[PDB]
């Protein structure tokens, strides 16, 4: 039994069967709690859930086929199972908080893609849309360990440590030393010799983060608002080390909308990037062009984080959920629509020992195990 809670925007029923359009307090999803989930993932007005059995369920807005259910217009108000993947045990589903395509990774290392195919982000040597998933053929001989998706590009890394990127090339988000759109997954040659263990991808004029088993954080791509973390605002298409995070023992990285977040093994959260609408959690909406510790969580051991477009959610070791950022749609979960300029404790989840959070564009998930 894994209790699941949802809140935020619900205009396209992306919360999965709740009434109203601004769910401003976390709310028990009867539909998702029943699925017994191991992961939830939030895309643009979309929700995805991976069950313990390996099944994938989606719901929300169906435009651009972003849900993989074979339709590509309308809304799916109750979570429905992605039938194309029933023969495969899905480990993880990757989707950006403002994304219109996703990928799903199976336990046997296979990778599928579906949704908006623009800029070749699906990986199929083409810019076709896929209304249902489709096996990324160019990765078949590679045991894939993790996957990530921005809004215009996608990544995947292998168990041997090599990182692949594909998709929109512009502003160097792929990391290949030019700005050429890649329609196939291509190896980031610069990061060879490092064992890459995570990767995160941004939306719009996108950044990309990478993490090696030595705790080294690489960033590249577009650099507006200093989301590359190395000051100023100059992009680049070659991975560069974010020197500040070195030795800090960073273990999770994520990319919201024009900002970057890292969490350390010691429970510290670092954010930087675009400041507007308090998405960084520093009490002010200025841009932060070199990674800063979120002071509002000093001494609270954050064990999990999730970023949406304009909000973040952090989980303490003791099952508490903090939030910060924008609240036009209740996604802060403080019962109002008032912005959370600093990390604020989330209402109505007392006694629920939350272990994982996930976010979408304007929606939030907390769940247990």
């Amino acid at each position: 039994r894994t209790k699941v809670f949802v809140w935020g925007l619900n205009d396209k029923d992306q919360l999965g069967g709740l009434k109203g359009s601004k769910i401003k307090v976390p709310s028990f999803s009867e539909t998702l709690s029943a699925l017994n989930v191991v992961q939830v993932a939030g895309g643009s007005k979309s929700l995805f859930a991976v069950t313990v059995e390996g099944k994938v369920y989606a719901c929300g807005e169906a435009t651009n086929g972003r849900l993989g259910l074979g339709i590509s217009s309308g809304t799916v108000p109750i979570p429905r199972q992605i039938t194309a993947l029933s023969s495969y045990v899905v480990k993880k589903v990757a989707v950006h908080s403002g994304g219109r395509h996703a990928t799903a990774l199976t336990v046997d290392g296979k990778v599928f893609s579906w949704g908006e195919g623009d800029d070749g982000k699906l990986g199929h040597f083409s810019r076709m849309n896929c209304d249902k998933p489709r096996l990324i053929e160019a990765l078949k001989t590679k045991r894939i360990r993790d996957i990530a998706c921005g809004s215009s590009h996608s990544a995947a890394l292998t168990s041997s440590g090599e990182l692949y990127t594909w998709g929109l090339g512009e502003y160097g988000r792929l990391g290949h030393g030019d700005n050429t759109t890649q329609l196939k997954p291509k190896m980031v040659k610069v990061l060879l010799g490092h064992r890459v263990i995570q990767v995160a991808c941004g939306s719009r004029d996108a950044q990309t983060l990478a993490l090696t088993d030595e705790g080294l954080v690489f960033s590249w791509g577009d650099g507006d608002f200093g989301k590359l973390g190395r000051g100023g605002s100059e992009g680049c298409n070659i991975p560069q080390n974010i020197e500040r995070l070195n030795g800090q023992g960073v273990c999770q990285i994520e990319c919201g909308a024009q900002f970057s977040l890292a969490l350390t093994k010691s429970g510290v959260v670092w954010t930087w990037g675009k400041g507007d609408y308090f998405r960084l959690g520093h009490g002010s909406d200025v841009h932060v062009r070199k990674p800063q510790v979120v002071e509002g969580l000093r001494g609270k051991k954050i064990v999990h984080v999730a970023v949406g477009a304009l909000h973040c959610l952090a989980v303490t070791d003791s099952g508490q959920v903090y939030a910060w950022g924008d609240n036009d749609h209740g996604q802060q979960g403080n019962g109002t629509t008032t912005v959370n300029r600093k990390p604020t404790l989330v209402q109505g989840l007392e006694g629920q020992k939350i272990t994982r959070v996930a976010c979408g564009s304007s929606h939030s998930v907390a769940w247990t195990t």
Binding site: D276, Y277, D326
Partner: peptide, 9 residues
């Protein structure tokens, strides 16, 4: 204004 911001119906 801010393009990365969702809207309601």
């Amino acid at each position: 204004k801010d393009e990365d911001k969702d809207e309601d119906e």
